[PDB]
C-alpha cells in the first residue's frame, strides 16, 4: 500500500484509525499514529491487506505509537488533502496562533489554528498530558491522523477532544472546539525515528 498521512487503517479487524506520518527506523519502514489506536503487536490493515503491526505505544499518559511495516509498503512524504497532497518538509513546531490543518479518514482535511499548548485531556482511561489544542474540527476515526502546517511542517498526531453526539465537533463553532494532538517531536526522539520528507 502507498502510506500517506490521513488514510484509514484498521486494527485487529475492528477499530479504525488514520495514519499520521511515514517514518523510518534504520532500514525499518513505519508510520507514527495514536497510542489509543492499538496495543503492541496489534495487526494493522490497509484496504484489507496486512501492512504491519504495532511496534510500541504509550497510552494514556501520552498518546503515541509507531507501526512497523513490511518491506513491501511504499512510504511517501505526503499527507492527504482530498485528492491532492501536502508535502512533508520537516517538524518545526508552530507557535500558539499559527494556522494548522489535520487529515483523517472521517472528516477529511480540516484547518484552524493552534490555541493552547500543554493541555491535559481527562479521558476515561486516564489523563493524557501535554497535548496541543487546535480548533480545526475532527471526528471518530480521525485519531492518529496528521496535523501539519500548509508549509509542510508536521506538528503531531490526532488524539481526541470534544466530540458531540453526531460523532464530530464540526457542527459547533471553531470557538467551542477542543481538538487535541500529541506533539510529533517527542515521538520521533522516544523511538529513534526519522520523518520521510520530500
Amino acid at each position: 500500500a502507498n502510506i500517506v498521512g490521513g488514510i484509514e487503517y484498521s486494527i485487529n479487524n475492528a477499530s479504525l484509525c488514520s495514519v499520521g506520518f511515514s517514518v523510518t527506523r534504520g532500514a525499518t519502514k513505519g508510520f507514527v499514529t495514536a497510542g489509543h489506536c492499538g496495543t503492541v503487536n496489534a495487526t494493522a490493515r490497509i484496504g484489507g491487506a496486512v501492512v504491519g503491526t504495532f511496534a510500541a505505544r504509550v497510552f494514556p499518559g501520552n498518546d503515541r505509537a509507531w507501526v512497523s511495516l513490511t518491506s513491501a509498503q511504499t512510504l511517501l512524504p505526503r499527507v492527504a488533502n482530498g485528492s491532492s497532497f501536502v508535502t512533508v518538509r520537516g517538524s518545526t513546531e508552530a507557535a500558539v496562533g499559527a494556522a494548522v490543518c489535520r487529515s483523517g479518514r472521517t472528516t477529511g482535511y480540516q484547518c484552524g489554528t493552534i490555541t493552547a499548548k500543554n493541555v491535559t485531556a481527562n479521558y476515561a482511561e486516564g489523563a493524557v498530558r501535554g497535548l496541543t489544542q487546535g480548533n480545526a474540527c475532527m471526528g471518530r476515526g480521525d485519531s492518529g491522523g496528521s496535523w501539519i502546517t500548509s508549509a509542510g511542517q508536521a506538528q503531531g498526531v490526532m488524539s481526541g477532544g470534544n466530540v458531540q453526539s453526531n460523532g464530530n465537533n464540526c457542527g459547533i463553532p471553531a470557538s467551542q472546539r477542543s481538538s487535541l494532538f500529541e506533539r510529533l517531536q517527542p515521538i520521533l526522539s522516544q523511538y529513534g525515528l526519522s520523518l520521510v520528507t520530500g
Binding site: T106, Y123, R140, D142, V163, S178
Partner: peptide, 6 residues
Amino acid sequence: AAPXXA
C-alpha cells in the same frame, strides 16, 4: 473529552 479511534 474522548480519544477518536472509531
